[PDB]
Amino acid sequence: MKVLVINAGSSSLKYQLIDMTNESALAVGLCERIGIDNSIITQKKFDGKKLEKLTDLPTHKDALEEVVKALTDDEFGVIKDMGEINAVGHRVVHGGEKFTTSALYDEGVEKAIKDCFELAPLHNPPNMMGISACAEIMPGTPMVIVFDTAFHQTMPPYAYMYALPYDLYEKHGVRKYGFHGTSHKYVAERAALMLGKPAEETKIITCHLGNGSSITAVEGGKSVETSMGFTPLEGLAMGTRCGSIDPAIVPFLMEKEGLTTREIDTLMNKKSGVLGVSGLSNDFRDLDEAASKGNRKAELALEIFAYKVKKFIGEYSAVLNGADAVVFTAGIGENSASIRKRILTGLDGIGIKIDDEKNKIRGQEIDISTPDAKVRVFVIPTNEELAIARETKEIVET
Amino acid sequence: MKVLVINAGSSSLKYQLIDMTNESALAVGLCERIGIDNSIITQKKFDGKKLEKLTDLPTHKDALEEVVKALTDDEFGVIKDMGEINAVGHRVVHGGEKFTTSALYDEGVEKAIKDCFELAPLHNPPNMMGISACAEIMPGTPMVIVFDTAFHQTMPPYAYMYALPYDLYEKHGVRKYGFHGTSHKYVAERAALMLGKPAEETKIITCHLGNGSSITAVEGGKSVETSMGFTPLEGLAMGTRCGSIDPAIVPFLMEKEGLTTREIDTLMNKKSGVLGVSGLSNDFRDLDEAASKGNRKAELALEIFAYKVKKFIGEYSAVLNGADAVVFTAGIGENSASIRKRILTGLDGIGIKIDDEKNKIRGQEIDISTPDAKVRVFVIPTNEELAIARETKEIVET
Ligand SMILES: Nc1ncnc2c1ncn2[C@@H]1O[C@H](COP(=O)(O)OP(=O)(O)O)[C@@H](O)[C@H]1O
Ligand SMILES: Nc1ncnc2c1ncn2[C@@H]1O[C@H](COP(=O)(O)OP(=O)(O)O)[C@@H](O)[C@H]1O
């Protein structure tokens, strides 16, 4: 089965055609400057052939029509006709409580998606232009919407409910949702394979450490607890987000600094995290160098960041009653040997011990723990597009 | 030297008269329903004699006047006249940045306590009322203030700093302080004795579970991390407090419901916790009974509460790199075998296993873990009053 994965932006459209037989990306592409002048589509075919075409792309529908032409090109394409695309997949952030699994697209899902957004306190609404264009160009092809909140819908009530007045949950839907679902589910699946046990028999803690960061406790293949909550702000300190602070600090700051609700929200989401502490950057690479060159604020920001991840590993070890493995993924998790070191030092007491040399390897699924450690520590690159395609294939199959 | 220890709440006042010659509690008492109807003072003398008086107590000053009359009663009292009270030690929750060690009461201490009213809204006002009541009733007696925050001053910067813009820490003193210090320090000491090791060699997790609840990670006798923060609101779900929720919920609620900063603070401190979830009570005894009789909201509130304590045990196990013991104290911690059961179930994976029969014993320092468990679980009655009296003696003596 071949799956086309679409990711649409205001004036762009990224795509990948993936063969699910071998999970190989046959072609990867990008349409830019849509609705602008000098539109362009660029496609890379697996064997090192690149196609570029300067043509006008007024709307996402035009871009998608070109994408199909580029995929079927005699020499630079990978399929003979549009009919070889068995399904299309798209990722949306919030599915609230309406979406407990990925969904087959139709007029119903389009409305539910819009509602989930207007009820949620999220910033950027979902971009539907890619999804819409798809319905016109390929009416007969199954389309699957994948939600980042979906994977966490298996959480029990004592985990997702906040200790707030119950009516707020009922009147405004306030509860923990969780994000990065697609990433957590994918690496949890890879980790089970590396443990050599069927997923149902595994207990895994997954750490998606990127500009946004979240940890999930995966029991027997299902999410049972996660660090982000009602919004992506809860939990860990991140690039520009403060994470879980004393809630009383909010009105205190609003009275002291004379701030509006929008200002305090912006302060917590964009001026906090390691950026806010370091006074320097929200980029962990920059902080790491700065810290070595002796920059104290940068050193403090990385200490706070690693310390909080360490604590969550302890927290989810209790949730899971002993974990079989801890997984690191995303930008920081996959690439930073030093940040992994800061996080994993001082945990032998709970069965975690790593090998400094194995921890230096990069871009690979690898167990970096000593062979005698009770808890395995795996570094597993997350692959967004492939995860979305697997989700799409599962739905289109069943 | 005889020290009177006072702990004042909104409508109550606990006291103990302790002889420092041998550290014996001569009399223990409680004034309840102050400022309400059917006020009552109850006193227990060391020889078992109990006094109860139904009288009207309009203000803390009236209650304190009765306390003195009960302490001097010919048969049920323990001293001949007020002059036998050499000093008074007061429990005060927040002293802010300026006061983080015990202090002889003076104009400056008073100022700091009133300035922190907004930082400990449920506590500082009543603590102040008890101090003023004491100044009027016994003008000539030395008064010593002992802060809930002192014990946590050993926390490292990466634990007490929030991932917020650094200037807020500098300009407004925003950082984690922690509370119940006196209780945590005392039971940590008792736990080291029970482990038969020098405090310096121990790693203990102390859980003070009462109307207010907090956990502390004690390493070698020093507090290294604790659950409450800038204010007593952070951390666990409590009787009427929500604990650590997604901070984004604050601005969100303010906008949806049109709430000012004062109202949202009251909502989080007075209408949340198990009271907010259950819709029934903030008393764990009542919830336990209601849960057993089939009340779902009450059952959910206790699950959320126990689950959060369980997670903190995991969190601090990582902080401490393996703990030697977990300690339960305060109202719920000392008396609820069933709540301890909910909390401690499913942790054998991290070395914690308890004996259901031992867990039924009450009012005793006892190890309730199975003999083979790697981590000991002790139930230890707290004695904040003897600890406050020790400080009072030291300060008044020098
Ligand atoms: N080698 C590295 N060392 C430290 N940090 C890195 C490294 N590589 C990437 N990062 C960090 O990872 C983040 C980008 O990762 P990414 O997975 O794309 O984030 P997100 O999941 O939030 O979209 C940035 O904050 C960046 O500084
Ligand atoms: N046997 C019990 N079972 C469950 N909860 C209890 C029990 N005894 C006391 N509690 C709870 O403990 C809390 C008492 O709070 P605390 O701060 O320790 O003060 P106090 O020592 O004055 O009772 C109350 O919420 C109360 O309902």
Q: For B264, how many CA atoms within 13 A lie in the half-sphere containing its CB?
A: 25
Element spanning A228, H or E: none
**Residue partners of B193: CB distance under 8 A and separation at least 6:** none
Q: How far is A175 from chain B (nearest CA, A)?
A: 9
Separation of alpha carbons B210 and B225, rounded Å: 19
Name the residue of A148, A182, A183, A211 whose CB sits within 8 Å of the most ligand 1 atoms, as the mutation to test its pocket.
Answer: A211
Please give the C-alpha separations between residue A53 and each of A40, A57, A76, A137, A320, in angstroms, as whole numbers: 6, 11, 12, 20, 52
Tell me the domain boundaries of chain A: 1-196, 197-398
Contact check, Cβ <8 Å, B162/A313: no
CB–CB of B144/B87 below 8 Å?
Answer: yes
Interatomic CA distance for residues B394 and B269, integer angstroms? 35
Q: Write the residue with the smallest CA distance to atom 6 of ligand 2.
A: B332
Query: Measured between CA atoms, how close is B214 to chain A, in angstroms?
Result: 13
Half-sphere exposure in the Cβ direction for B300 (13 Å, CA) = 21
Across the interface, whether the CB atoms of A158 and B321 are under 8 A apart is answered no
Q: Whose CA is nearest to atom 15 of ligand 2?
A: B210
Q: How many helices (H) and strands (E) does chain B have?
A: 14, 14
| Alpha helix ranges (H) inside A350-383 | none
In A56-128, alpha helices (H): 60-71, 107-119
Is the minimum distance from the CB of A235 to ligand 1 under 6 angstroms?
no
The Cα–Cα gap between A161 and B356 comes to 29
Residue B229: closest CA among chain A residues belongs to which residue? A246
Amino acid at A112: A
Does residue B15 line the site of ligand 2, with CB under 6 A?
A: no
| 66-105 of B, contacting A, C-beta below 8 A | none
Q: In what order do the strands lie in the sheet with B203-209?
A: B222-226, B213-219, B203-209, B325-329, B376-379, B366-367
Question: What are residue A57's phi and psi, to 5 degrees?
Answer: -120, 85
Q: Distance from the CA of B284 to the center of ligand 2, in angstroms?
A: 7
Resolution expressed in Å: 2.5
Smallest CA-to-CA distance from A391 within A101, A108, A188, A190 is with A101
User: Bridge partners of A221?
Assistant: none
Query: Encoding tokens for residue B156?
Result: 């490292």
CA distances from B78 to A365, B1, B30 (A): 73, 13, 16
Give bridge partners of residue B378 from the DSSP assignment: B327, B367
Pair A236, A243: CB distance under 8 Å: yes
Kindly report the CATH class assigned to A197-398. Answer: alpha beta
Structure tokens at A273: 């995290």
**DSSP letters spanning B192-222:** HHHHTS-GGG-EEEEEEESSSEEEEEEETTE
Q: B1-196 and B197-398 share one CATH topology?
A: yes
Which residues of chain A neighbour B256 with C-beta distances below 8 Å? 172
B13 SS3 class: strand
Ligand 1 nearest-atom number relative to CA A335: 1
Query: Does A86 carry a binding-site annotation?
Result: no
Spatial contact of B65 and B15, defined as CB atoms under 8 Å apart:
no
Our mutation pick for probing the ligand 1 site, out of A182, A241, A284, counting the most ligand atoms within 8 A of Cβ, is A284
State how far the Cα of B244 lies from the Cα of B64, in Å rounded to an integer: 36
Question: Which ligand sits nearest to residue A179's alpha carbon?
Answer: 1
A283 in contact with ligand 1, CB cutoff 6 A: yes
Rounded Cα–Cα distance for residues A215 and A183 (Å): 11
Q: Is B300 on the interface with A (CB under 8 A)?
A: yes
Q: What angle do CA A78, A45, A20 make, to 5 degrees?
A: 60
| Residue burial B148-167, b: 16+ Cβ < 10 Å; e: rest | bbbbbeebeebbbbbbbbbe
* B254 interaction partners in chain A (CB closer than 8 Å): 261
Q: Give chain A's largest Cα–Cα span.
A: 66
Ligand sitting nearest the alpha carbon of A211 = 1
Three-class DSSP category at B398: coil
Q: Is the CB of A348 inside 8 Å of chain B's CB atoms?
A: yes
User: What does the DSSP 8-state code read for residue A154?
Assistant: G
Element housing A32 (H / E): strand A24-32
Q: Which of B64, B66, B34 is nearest to B52 (CA)?
A: B66
CATH class label, B1-196? alpha beta
Task: Name residues whose C-beta falls within 8 Å of residue B327's C-beta, 6 or more positions apart in sequence.
Answer: B187, B188, B190, B191, B204, B205, B206, B207, B377, B378, B379, B380
List the alpha helices (DSSP H) in chain B: 60-71, 107-115, 124-137, 157-160, 166-172, 181-195, 249-257, 261-270, 273-278, 284-292, 296-319, 330-335, 337-344, 384-397
CB A113 within 8 A of CB A106: no
Determine whether the interchain pair B321/A233 forms a contact, defined as Cβ–Cβ distance below 8 Å. Answer: no
> How is residue A186 written in tokens?
């994918």
User: How far is residue B301's CA from residue B241's CA, in Å, rounded to a whole number?
Assistant: 12
Classify A8 as helix, strand or coil.
strand
CB count, 10 Å around CB of A288? 18
Q: Which of A62, A148, A288, A324 is catalytic?
A: A148
Atom of ligand 2 nearest to the CA of B283: 27
